[PDB]
């Protein structure tokens, strides 16, 4: 009876959130005034890194001044590629140092590695769907220039901001009281992880190999100690690094800024109500699921949370 | 109730301290990245210490060398340049205006005006060309 | 209007401005800078945006409609130019910022 009640209020809360997403556009998530930072593709990768760090961002649309076209987004992945190229080609330090953003495609070719957008006026639910299935944590908001008839970046919408927008407007999240363990939305199987002595380069390899935002760092006995995020790669490359390539992840983590907000953990008995509370109060990108004693059992990311909201169990 | 925590060993101060206690040599060598996010001072357009006709002269020379065209100004609007720049509409329109801040201090205001046979980046890129041309000719 | 690449004589020939001075008010000198385009206002407009995303204070800074589509600049840093324009998107306002190198 009490578990049947918990279950119906959850459905009630989910159906309400869903209706909110179907009733709002991506444009509605936009602040009334905001900044869009765009980088000309002839800018040095080196300098574009400083731009991102100065302005507390991790992504920026790219603009080709020769063709008057947008040319995709700069993300941590691009910097992974540069690191991987350099590690494999340590002789090419000069090329890497003078690498321009439009030279990024040649780096990709040398490595042999292979973008969703949405019209702002479209339903926010639809923006959530497209972002999920593009396997990206971001979606550029693109419209058409009324004069030139050209594709224009209006903004970049992130999973975090969407979930925060939901959380802020919809206090019904409080009634999502089913433990996440009973919801079958945590990834438990085939956790890609490493240890403190694992070379950072191999962890970076794991990032692109698994197509994941972070690698959990455990000890011999499976206790979660820390995490390596793709975001950390920016810090790693900052100021040009060469001796600090074959470094261990533990060593590389000392580059982390003192205002690093930390890694979030939870257990299977935590509720999405609490999870949304945290998203609402702080920029949290995932919750690593541990057991009673702090051993890693799994992870609950923003994409998992959003997938549940849209699709269910 | 809530078992949502921040992992203490994930925090820089504890991670460092554990690495130092483990004896790691890189613990003392590696310092945390301190990104000095310095607030940039923003201004509309560019300022100039030269005088009106001199400044207006400089601007037109830049415009001409950059391949732009402009209207013939009347007496009432001498310090206004209604220009057109080659770069589906083909020609970008700009309105440049000279303002006075002080007797020796002037501001060159640039305004996007449209297209002739929305995104500000074509406009921003062109003003970039213009600003750079003006800096050389000084 | 008719468009041409001929620089107005007033800026190339001293005779033209001389005639104006001599032939018997405000139009002989450039107009004063409008209060809206003052850099103290532009940056408190920047500080209120930063105050909302880092501290959460008050409401977001609506720009004055006067400044829309006007070029914003800053000092050249690391051979990189940083220009911006505050533009309209529906009922929202986008400060479109561009970083370009000096080549
Ligand atoms: N290079 C690429 O293609 C990359 C793609 N992405 C994608 O971005 C989207 C959203 O990202 P986020 O919300 O940050 O989620 P995420 O990037 O952490 O998502 C990865 C998926 O696998 C799970 N996961 C996360 N870390 C894992 C690990 N270390 N080992 C095993 N499974 C792990 C998550 O629960 C999630 O279902 C995801 O679809 C993710 O795949 C993220 C990084 C790189």
Coordinates of C-alpha atoms and ligand atoms in Angstrom, one line a residue:
Chain A
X1 CA 0.0 0.0 0.0
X2 CA 2.8 2.5 1.0
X3 CA 5.0 1.1 -1.8
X4 CA 2.0 1.3 -4.2
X5 CA 1.6 5.0 -3.1
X6 CA 5.3 5.7 -3.6
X7 CA 5.0 4.1 -7.1
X8 CA 2.0 6.2 -8.2
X9 CA 3.5 9.5 -7.0
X10 CA 6.7 8.7 -8.9
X11 CA 4.7 8.1 -12.1
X12 CA 2.8 11.3 -11.3
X13 CA 6.0 13.2 -10.9
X14 CA 7.6 11.7 -14.0
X15 CA 4.5 12.4 -16.2
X16 CA 4.5 16.0 -14.9
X17 CA 8.2 16.6 -15.7
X18 CA 7.5 15.0 -19.1
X19 CA 4.6 17.4 -19.8
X20 CA 6.9 20.3 -18.8
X21 CA 9.5 19.2 -21.3
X22 CA 6.8 18.8 -24.0
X23 CA 5.4 22.2 -23.2
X24 CA 8.7 24.1 -23.2
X25 CA 11.1 25.0 -26.0
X26 CA 14.9 25.0 -25.9
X27 CA 14.7 28.7 -26.3
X28 CA 12.8 28.9 -22.9
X29 CA 15.9 27.5 -21.2
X30 CA 17.9 30.5 -22.4
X31 CA 18.5 33.3 -19.9
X32 CA 17.0 36.6 -21.0
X33 CA 20.5 37.8 -21.7
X34 CA 23.7 35.7 -22.0
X35 CA 27.1 35.3 -23.7
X36 CA 28.0 33.2 -26.7
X37 CA 31.8 32.6 -27.2
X38 CA 32.8 31.6 -30.7
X39 CA 36.3 31.0 -31.9
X40 CA 37.6 31.6 -35.4
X41 CA 39.1 28.4 -36.8
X42 CA 42.4 30.0 -37.6
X43 CA 43.0 30.5 -33.9
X44 CA 45.7 28.3 -32.3
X45 CA 44.5 25.3 -30.4
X46 CA 47.0 26.5 -27.8
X47 CA 45.2 29.8 -27.4
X48 CA 41.7 28.4 -27.7
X49 CA 42.5 26.3 -24.6
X50 CA 43.3 29.5 -22.7
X51 CA 40.0 31.1 -23.9
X52 CA 38.0 28.1 -22.5
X53 CA 39.8 28.2 -19.2
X54 CA 39.6 32.0 -18.8
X55 CA 35.8 32.0 -19.4
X56 CA 35.0 28.9 -17.3
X57 CA 33.7 26.9 -20.3
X58 CA 34.5 23.5 -21.7
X59 CA 33.1 24.0 -25.2
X60 CA 32.8 26.7 -28.0
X61 CA 31.3 26.8 -31.4
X62 CA 33.8 27.3 -34.3
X63 CA 33.5 29.8 -37.1
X64 CA 35.2 29.7 -40.5
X65 CA 35.8 33.3 -41.6
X66 CA 36.8 32.3 -45.1
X67 CA 33.5 30.5 -45.9
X68 CA 31.2 32.3 -43.3
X69 CA 30.1 29.0 -42.0
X70 CA 30.0 27.4 -38.5
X71 CA 32.4 24.5 -38.3
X72 CA 31.3 22.4 -35.3
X73 CA 32.1 22.6 -31.6
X74 CA 35.5 22.6 -29.8
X75 CA 35.3 20.1 -27.0
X76 CA 37.6 18.1 -24.7
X77 CA 37.5 15.3 -27.3
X78 CA 39.5 17.5 -29.7
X79 CA 42.1 18.0 -27.0
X80 CA 42.2 14.2 -26.4
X81 CA 43.0 13.8 -30.1
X82 CA 45.9 16.4 -29.9
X83 CA 47.3 14.6 -26.8
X84 CA 47.0 11.2 -28.5
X85 CA 48.6 12.5 -31.7
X86 CA 51.5 14.1 -29.8
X87 CA 52.1 11.0 -27.6
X88 CA 52.3 8.9 -30.8
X89 CA 54.3 11.5 -32.6
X90 CA 56.5 13.2 -29.9
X91 CA 58.8 14.4 -32.8
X92 CA 56.0 16.7 -34.0
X93 CA 56.1 19.1 -31.0
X94 CA 56.5 22.1 -33.3
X95 CA 53.5 21.2 -35.4
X96 CA 51.3 20.6 -32.3
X97 CA 52.4 23.9 -30.8
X98 CA 51.5 25.8 -34.0
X99 CA 48.4 23.8 -34.6
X100 CA 45.3 25.8 -35.6
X101 CA 41.7 24.7 -35.1
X102 CA 41.3 24.2 -38.8
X103 CA 44.2 21.8 -38.6
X104 CA 42.3 19.6 -36.2
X105 CA 40.8 17.5 -39.1
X106 CA 44.3 16.5 -40.2
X107 CA 45.2 15.3 -36.7
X108 CA 42.0 13.2 -36.8
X109 CA 43.0 11.7 -40.2
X110 CA 46.5 10.8 -38.9
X111 CA 44.9 9.0 -35.9
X112 CA 42.1 7.5 -38.0
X113 CA 39.3 8.6 -35.7
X114 CA 35.7 9.4 -36.9
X115 CA 27.0 16.7 -34.5
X116 CA 23.4 17.1 -33.6
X117 CA 21.7 20.5 -33.5
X118 CA 18.2 21.8 -32.9
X119 CA 16.0 24.7 -33.9
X120 CA 15.5 26.7 -30.6
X121 CA 11.7 26.9 -31.2
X122 CA 11.4 23.0 -31.1
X123 CA 10.0 21.3 -28.0
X124 CA 12.6 20.9 -25.2
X125 CA 11.7 17.2 -24.9
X126 CA 12.8 16.8 -28.6
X127 CA 16.1 18.6 -27.7
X128 CA 16.6 16.1 -24.9
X129 CA 15.9 13.1 -27.2
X130 CA 18.3 14.3 -29.9
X131 CA 21.1 15.0 -27.4
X132 CA 20.7 11.6 -25.8
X133 CA 20.9 9.7 -29.1
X134 CA 23.7 11.9 -30.6
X135 CA 25.7 10.5 -27.6
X136 CA 26.7 14.0 -26.5
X137 CA 26.3 16.1 -23.3
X138 CA 25.6 19.2 -25.4
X139 CA 23.4 20.4 -28.2
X140 CA 24.0 23.6 -30.3
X141 CA 20.9 25.7 -30.8
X142 CA 21.0 26.6 -34.5
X143 CA 18.6 28.9 -36.4
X144 CA 18.5 30.5 -39.8
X145 CA 19.8 34.1 -40.4
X146 CA 16.9 36.1 -41.7
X147 CA 19.1 38.0 -44.2
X148 CA 22.0 35.7 -45.4
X149 CA 19.9 32.4 -45.2
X150 CA 22.8 30.9 -43.2
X151 CA 22.9 28.5 -40.2
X152 CA 23.5 30.4 -37.0
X153 CA 24.5 29.3 -33.5
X154 CA 22.1 30.9 -31.0
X155 CA 23.5 29.0 -28.0
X156 CA 24.8 25.7 -26.8
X157 CA 22.5 23.7 -24.5
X158 CA 23.9 21.2 -22.0
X159 CA 22.3 18.3 -20.2
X160 CA 23.2 19.9 -16.8
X161 CA 21.4 23.2 -17.7
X162 CA 18.3 21.3 -19.0
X163 CA 18.1 19.2 -15.8
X164 CA 18.7 22.3 -13.7
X165 CA 15.9 24.1 -15.6
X166 CA 13.6 21.1 -14.9
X167 CA 14.7 21.0 -11.3
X168 CA 14.1 24.7 -10.7
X169 CA 10.7 24.9 -12.3
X170 CA 9.4 21.5 -11.1
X171 CA 9.5 20.8 -7.4
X172 CA 7.5 17.7 -8.1
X173 CA 11.0 16.1 -8.3
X174 CA 10.5 15.7 -4.5
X175 CA 8.0 12.9 -5.2
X176 CA 10.5 10.8 -7.1
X177 CA 11.0 8.6 -4.0
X178 CA 11.8 5.2 -5.6
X179 CA 15.4 4.1 -4.8
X180 CA 17.5 4.3 -8.0
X181 CA 18.5 0.7 -7.4
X182 CA 14.9 -0.4 -8.1
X183 CA 14.7 1.7 -11.3
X184 CA 17.3 -0.2 -13.3
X185 CA 19.0 3.0 -14.7
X186 CA 22.5 2.7 -13.2
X187 CA 25.2 1.2 -15.3
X188 CA 26.8 -1.6 -13.3
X189 CA 28.1 -3.9 -16.1
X190 CA 31.6 -3.5 -17.6
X191 CA 32.7 -0.5 -15.6
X192 CA 35.8 1.0 -17.2
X193 CA 38.2 1.9 -14.3
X194 CA 41.8 2.4 -13.4
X195 CA 44.1 2.7 -10.4
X196 CA 46.3 5.6 -9.1
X197 CA 49.4 4.2 -10.8
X198 CA 47.8 3.8 -14.2
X199 CA 49.5 6.2 -16.7
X200 CA 47.3 9.2 -17.5
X201 CA 47.8 8.5 -21.2
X202 CA 46.2 5.1 -20.8
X203 CA 43.3 6.6 -18.9
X204 CA 42.9 9.2 -21.7
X205 CA 42.9 6.2 -24.1
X206 CA 40.1 4.7 -22.0
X207 CA 38.1 7.9 -22.3
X208 CA 37.9 7.8 -26.1
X209 CA 37.8 4.0 -26.2
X210 CA 34.7 3.8 -24.0
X211 CA 33.2 7.1 -25.2
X212 CA 32.7 8.2 -21.6
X213 CA 33.2 11.5 -19.7
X214 CA 35.2 10.0 -16.9
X215 CA 37.1 7.0 -15.5
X216 CA 36.7 6.0 -11.9
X217 CA 39.8 5.4 -9.9
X218 CA 39.8 2.4 -7.5
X219 CA 42.3 0.7 -5.3
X220 CA 43.3 -3.0 -5.1
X221 CA 40.1 -3.8 -3.2
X222 CA 37.6 -1.9 -5.4
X223 CA 37.3 1.2 -3.2
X224 CA 36.5 4.3 -5.2
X225 CA 39.3 6.8 -4.5
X226 CA 39.0 9.4 -7.2
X227 CA 38.0 10.0 -10.8
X228 CA 39.6 11.2 -14.0
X229 CA 37.4 13.4 -16.2
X230 CA 37.9 14.4 -19.8
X231 CA 37.7 18.0 -18.4
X232 CA 41.0 17.4 -16.6
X233 CA 42.7 17.0 -19.9
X234 CA 42.5 20.8 -20.4
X235 CA 44.4 21.3 -17.1
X236 CA 46.9 18.6 -18.3
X237 CA 47.6 20.3 -21.7
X238 CA 47.7 23.8 -20.2
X239 CA 51.0 25.7 -20.7
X240 CA 52.3 23.0 -22.9
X241 CA 53.2 19.6 -21.3
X242 CA 55.7 17.0 -22.5
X243 CA 57.4 15.5 -19.4
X244 CA 53.9 15.3 -17.9
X245 CA 52.6 12.8 -20.5
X246 CA 53.9 9.4 -19.2
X247 CA 52.9 10.6 -15.7
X248 CA 50.6 8.5 -13.6
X249 CA 46.9 9.6 -13.2
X250 CA 47.6 10.1 -9.5
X251 CA 50.4 12.5 -10.4
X252 CA 48.4 14.2 -13.2
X253 CA 45.6 14.9 -10.7
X254 CA 47.8 17.3 -8.8
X255 CA 47.3 19.7 -11.7
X256 CA 43.7 19.9 -10.6
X257 CA 42.7 23.4 -9.5
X258 CA 41.9 24.0 -5.8
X259 CA 38.4 25.0 -6.6
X260 CA 37.7 21.5 -8.0
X261 CA 34.2 20.9 -6.7
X262 CA 34.7 17.2 -6.0
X263 CA 33.3 13.8 -7.0
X264 CA 29.7 12.9 -6.1
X265 CA 28.8 9.5 -4.7
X266 CA 25.5 7.9 -3.8
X267 CA 24.2 4.4 -3.0
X268 CA 21.4 2.3 -4.6
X269 CA 19.0 3.5 -1.9
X270 CA 19.3 7.1 -2.9
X271 CA 16.3 8.7 -4.6
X272 CA 16.0 10.9 -7.7
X273 CA 14.3 13.5 -5.5
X274 CA 17.7 13.9 -3.7
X275 CA 19.6 13.7 -7.0
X276 CA 17.6 16.5 -8.5
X277 CA 18.1 18.5 -5.2
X278 CA 21.8 18.2 -5.8
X279 CA 21.6 19.1 -9.5
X280 CA 19.5 22.2 -8.5
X281 CA 22.0 23.4 -5.9
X282 CA 25.3 22.5 -7.6
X283 CA 26.9 21.6 -11.0
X284 CA 27.1 17.8 -10.6
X285 CA 27.7 15.8 -13.8
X286 CA 27.4 12.2 -12.4
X287 CA 26.9 10.3 -9.2
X288 CA 29.2 7.3 -8.7
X289 CA 27.2 4.5 -7.0
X290 CA 29.1 2.9 -4.1
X291 CA 28.0 0.3 -1.5
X292 CA 28.0 0.6 2.4
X293 CA 31.8 0.6 2.7
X294 CA 32.6 2.8 -0.4
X295 CA 33.3 0.3 -3.1
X296 CA 32.4 1.2 -6.7
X297 CA 29.3 -0.7 -7.8
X298 CA 28.3 1.7 -10.7
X299 CA 27.6 5.2 -12.0
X300 CA 24.5 7.4 -12.6
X301 CA 25.2 10.1 -15.1
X302 CA 23.0 13.0 -16.3
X303 CA 22.4 11.1 -19.5
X304 CA 21.0 8.2 -17.4
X305 CA 18.8 10.6 -15.4
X306 CA 17.5 12.2 -18.6
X307 CA 17.0 8.8 -20.3
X308 CA 14.9 7.8 -17.3
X309 CA 12.9 11.0 -17.4
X310 CA 12.2 10.6 -21.2
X311 CA 11.9 6.8 -21.5
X312 CA 11.4 5.3 -18.1
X313 CA 12.9 2.1 -16.6
Chain B
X1 CA 18.2 9.4 4.6
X2 CA 20.5 11.0 2.0
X3 CA 23.6 9.0 1.1
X4 CA 24.7 11.5 -1.4
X5 CA 28.3 12.7 -0.6
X6 CA 31.3 14.4 -2.0
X7 CA 34.1 11.8 -2.0
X8 CA 36.7 13.3 0.4
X9 CA 39.7 11.7 -1.4
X10 CA 38.6 13.4 -4.7
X11 CA 39.3 16.8 -3.2
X12 CA 42.6 18.4 -4.2
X13 CA 43.9 18.9 -0.6
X14 CA 43.3 15.2 0.4
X15 CA 44.5 13.8 -2.9
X16 CA 47.7 15.8 -2.7
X17 CA 48.3 14.9 1.0
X18 CA 47.8 11.2 0.3
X19 CA 50.3 11.4 -2.6
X20 CA 52.8 13.1 -0.4
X21 CA 52.4 10.5 2.4
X22 CA 52.9 7.8 -0.3
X23 CA 56.2 9.4 -0.8
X24 CA 55.6 10.4 -4.5
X25 CA 58.3 12.8 -5.8
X26 CA 55.9 14.6 -8.1
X27 CA 53.7 15.6 -5.1
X28 CA 56.0 18.6 -4.2
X29 CA 57.0 19.3 -7.8
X30 CA 53.5 19.5 -9.3
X31 CA 51.5 22.6 -8.3
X32 CA 47.8 23.0 -9.0
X33 CA 46.8 25.0 -12.1
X34 CA 45.9 28.5 -10.9
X35 CA 43.8 30.1 -13.7
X36 CA 43.8 33.8 -13.0
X37 CA 40.3 34.6 -14.5
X38 CA 41.0 38.4 -14.9
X39 CA 37.9 40.5 -15.6
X40 CA 38.4 42.1 -19.1
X41 CA 37.4 45.8 -19.5
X42 CA 35.0 46.2 -22.4
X43 CA 34.4 49.3 -24.5
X44 CA 32.1 50.1 -27.3
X45 CA 34.2 50.6 -30.5
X46 CA 37.7 52.0 -30.4
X47 CA 39.0 55.2 -28.8
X48 CA 41.2 57.8 -30.5
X49 CA 43.4 60.7 -29.2
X50 CA 43.6 62.4 -32.6
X51 CA 41.1 65.0 -33.8
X52 CA 37.8 64.7 -35.7
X53 CA 38.9 65.3 -39.4
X54 CA 42.2 63.5 -38.8
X55 CA 40.3 60.4 -37.3
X56 CA 37.7 60.5 -40.1
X57 CA 40.4 60.8 -42.6
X58 CA 42.2 57.7 -41.2
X59 CA 38.9 55.6 -41.2
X60 CA 38.1 56.4 -44.9
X61 CA 41.7 55.4 -46.0
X62 CA 41.3 52.1 -44.2
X63 CA 37.8 51.6 -45.8
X64 CA 39.2 52.3 -49.3
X65 CA 42.2 50.0 -49.0
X66 CA 39.9 47.3 -47.7
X67 CA 37.6 47.7 -50.8
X68 CA 34.5 49.2 -49.2
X69 CA 32.1 51.9 -50.6
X70 CA 30.1 54.6 -48.8
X71 CA 27.4 57.3 -49.3
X72 CA 28.1 61.0 -49.7
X73 CA 27.5 62.7 -46.3
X74 CA 25.6 65.9 -45.9
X75 CA 26.4 68.9 -43.6
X76 CA 24.2 67.6 -40.8
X77 CA 25.9 64.2 -40.6
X78 CA 29.6 64.8 -41.3
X79 CA 30.7 62.4 -38.6
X80 CA 28.5 59.5 -39.8
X81 CA 29.7 57.0 -42.4
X82 CA 27.0 55.0 -44.2
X83 CA 29.1 52.3 -45.8
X84 CA 28.8 49.2 -47.8
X85 CA 31.2 46.3 -47.9
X86 CA 31.4 43.4 -50.5
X87 CA 32.6 40.7 -48.1
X88 CA 21.4 35.7 -51.1
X89 CA 22.3 39.3 -50.2
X90 CA 25.9 40.3 -51.1
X91 CA 26.7 43.6 -49.6
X92 CA 27.0 44.3 -45.8
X93 CA 25.9 47.7 -44.5
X94 CA 27.7 49.4 -41.6
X95 CA 27.1 52.8 -39.9
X96 CA 30.3 54.3 -38.4
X97 CA 29.8 57.2 -36.0
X98 CA 32.3 59.5 -34.3
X99 CA 31.4 60.6 -30.8
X100 CA 33.2 63.0 -28.4
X101 CA 34.2 61.9 -24.9
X102 CA 36.6 64.8 -24.1
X103 CA 38.3 67.6 -26.1
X104 CA 41.2 65.2 -26.9
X105 CA 39.2 61.9 -26.5
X106 CA 37.0 60.5 -29.2
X107 CA 35.1 57.2 -29.8
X108 CA 34.7 55.4 -33.1
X109 CA 31.3 53.6 -32.9
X110 CA 30.6 50.7 -35.3
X111 CA 27.1 49.6 -36.0
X112 CA 25.8 46.6 -38.2
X113 CA 23.2 48.0 -40.5
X114 CA 22.1 45.0 -42.6
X115 CA 22.5 43.3 -46.0
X116 CA 21.8 44.3 -49.6
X117 CA 21.8 42.6 -53.0
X118 CA 20.6 37.0 -36.9
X119 CA 24.4 36.4 -36.9
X120 CA 26.9 39.2 -36.2
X121 CA 30.0 37.2 -37.0
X122 CA 30.5 38.4 -40.6
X123 CA 30.2 41.9 -39.1
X124 CA 32.6 41.1 -36.3
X125 CA 35.1 39.6 -38.6
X126 CA 35.0 42.6 -40.9
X127 CA 35.4 45.1 -38.1
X128 CA 38.4 43.0 -37.1
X129 CA 39.9 43.7 -40.5
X130 CA 39.1 47.4 -40.2
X131 CA 40.5 47.7 -36.6
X132 CA 43.7 46.0 -37.8
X133 CA 44.1 48.2 -40.8
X134 CA 43.6 51.3 -38.6
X135 CA 46.3 50.2 -36.2
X136 CA 48.9 49.7 -38.9
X137 CA 48.3 53.1 -40.4
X138 CA 49.3 54.7 -37.0
Chain C
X1 CA 21.5 56.4 -51.7
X2 CA 24.3 56.4 -54.3
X3 CA 27.5 54.6 -53.3
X4 CA 31.1 55.3 -54.4
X5 CA 34.8 55.0 -53.3
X6 CA 35.5 58.7 -53.3
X7 CA 36.5 60.1 -49.9
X8 CA 34.3 63.1 -49.0
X9 CA 36.3 66.3 -49.7
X10 CA 35.9 67.7 -46.2
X11 CA 38.5 65.1 -45.0
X12 CA 40.9 65.5 -47.8
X13 CA 40.7 69.2 -48.8
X14 CA 41.1 71.9 -46.1
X15 CA 39.1 74.4 -48.2
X16 CA 35.8 72.5 -47.4
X17 CA 35.8 72.8 -43.6
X18 CA 37.2 76.3 -44.0
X19 CA 34.1 77.4 -45.9
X20 CA 31.8 75.9 -43.2
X21 CA 33.7 77.8 -40.4
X22 CA 33.5 81.1 -42.3
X23 CA 30.0 81.1 -43.9
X24 CA 27.7 82.6 -41.1
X25 CA 26.3 75.4 -33.7
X26 CA 26.7 71.7 -32.9
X27 CA 27.2 70.2 -36.4
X28 CA 30.8 71.4 -36.9
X29 CA 31.9 69.1 -34.1
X30 CA 31.1 65.4 -33.5
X31 CA 28.2 64.7 -31.1
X32 CA 28.8 63.8 -27.4
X33 CA 28.8 60.1 -26.5
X34 CA 25.3 58.9 -25.5
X35 CA 25.1 57.8 -21.8
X36 CA 24.1 54.3 -23.0
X37 CA 27.4 53.8 -24.8
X38 CA 29.4 54.6 -21.7
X39 CA 31.9 51.8 -20.7
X40 CA 31.0 52.1 -17.0
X41 CA 27.4 51.0 -17.9
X42 CA 28.6 48.3 -20.4
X43 CA 30.7 46.6 -17.7
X44 CA 28.1 46.8 -14.9
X45 CA 25.9 45.2 -17.5
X46 CA 28.7 42.5 -17.7
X47 CA 29.0 42.4 -13.8
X48 CA 25.3 41.7 -13.3
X49 CA 25.4 38.7 -15.6
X50 CA 28.5 37.4 -13.7
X51 CA 26.7 38.2 -10.4
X52 CA 23.8 35.9 -11.4
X53 CA 25.8 32.9 -12.6
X54 CA 28.5 32.9 -9.8
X55 CA 26.6 34.5 -6.8
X56 CA 22.9 34.6 -7.9
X57 CA 22.0 38.3 -7.2
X58 CA 18.8 40.0 -8.4
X59 CA 17.8 39.8 -12.0
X60 CA 19.7 39.4 -15.3
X61 CA 21.0 42.5 -17.1
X62 CA 18.7 43.5 -19.9
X63 CA 20.7 45.6 -22.4
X64 CA 19.5 49.0 -23.3
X65 CA 18.1 48.7 -26.9
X66 CA 20.4 51.6 -28.0
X67 CA 23.5 49.4 -27.8
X68 CA 22.2 46.5 -30.0
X69 CA 24.3 45.7 -33.0
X70 CA 27.1 48.0 -31.9
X71 CA 30.7 46.7 -31.8
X72 CA 32.2 45.9 -28.4
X73 CA 36.0 45.6 -28.1
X74 CA 38.7 44.9 -25.5
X75 CA 42.5 45.2 -25.4
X76 CA 44.5 42.9 -27.7
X77 CA 45.8 40.0 -25.7
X78 CA 48.2 37.2 -26.9
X79 CA 47.9 38.5 -30.5
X80 CA 44.2 37.7 -30.3
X81 CA 41.4 40.1 -31.0
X82 CA 38.3 39.8 -29.0
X83 CA 35.2 41.6 -30.4
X84 CA 31.5 41.3 -29.5
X85 CA 28.1 42.5 -30.4
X86 CA 24.9 42.4 -28.3
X87 CA 22.2 41.2 -30.6
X88 CA 18.5 40.4 -30.4
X89 CA 17.2 36.8 -30.5
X90 CA 13.4 36.9 -30.3
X91 CA 12.8 38.3 -26.8
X92 CA 16.3 37.3 -25.5
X93 CA 19.7 39.0 -25.9
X94 CA 22.9 37.3 -27.1
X95 CA 26.3 38.9 -26.6
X96 CA 28.0 37.3 -29.6
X97 CA 31.8 37.1 -28.8
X98 CA 34.5 36.4 -31.4
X99 CA 38.1 35.4 -30.8
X100 CA 40.3 35.9 -33.9
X101 CA 44.0 35.9 -34.3
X102 CA 46.1 38.8 -35.6
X103 CA 47.7 37.0 -38.5
Ligands
LIG1 N1 34.0 10.4 -27.6 C1 32.7 10.2 -27.4 O1 31.9 9.8 -28.3 C2 32.1 10.6 -26.2 C3 30.8 10.6 -26.0 N2 30.2 10.9 -24.7 C4 28.7 10.8 -24.5 O2 28.2 12.0 -23.9 C5 26.8 11.6 -23.5 C6 26.4 12.3 -22.2 O3 27.6 12.2 -21.3 P1 27.4 12.0 -19.7 O4 26.1 12.4 -19.2 O5 28.6 12.7 -19.1 O6 27.5 10.5 -19.4 P2 28.9 9.6 -19.7 O7 29.7 10.1 -20.7 O8 29.5 9.3 -18.3 O9 28.0 8.3 -20.2 C7 28.5 7.1 -20.5 C8 27.5 6.0 -20.4 O10 28.1 4.8 -19.8 C9 28.1 5.0 -18.4 N3 29.5 5.3 -17.9 C10 30.0 6.4 -17.5 N4 31.3 6.2 -17.2 C11 31.6 4.9 -17.3 C12 32.6 4.2 -17.2 N5 33.7 4.8 -16.7 N6 32.7 2.9 -17.4 C13 31.5 2.2 -17.9 N7 30.4 3.0 -18.1 C14 30.4 4.3 -17.8 C15 27.1 6.0 -18.0 O11 26.2 5.6 -17.0 C16 26.4 6.3 -19.3 O12 25.3 5.4 -19.5 C17 26.9 10.1 -23.3 O13 26.0 9.5 -24.3 C18 28.3 9.7 -23.6 O14 28.5 8.5 -24.2 C19 31.1 11.4 -23.7 C20 32.4 11.4 -23.9 C21 33.0 11.1 -25.1

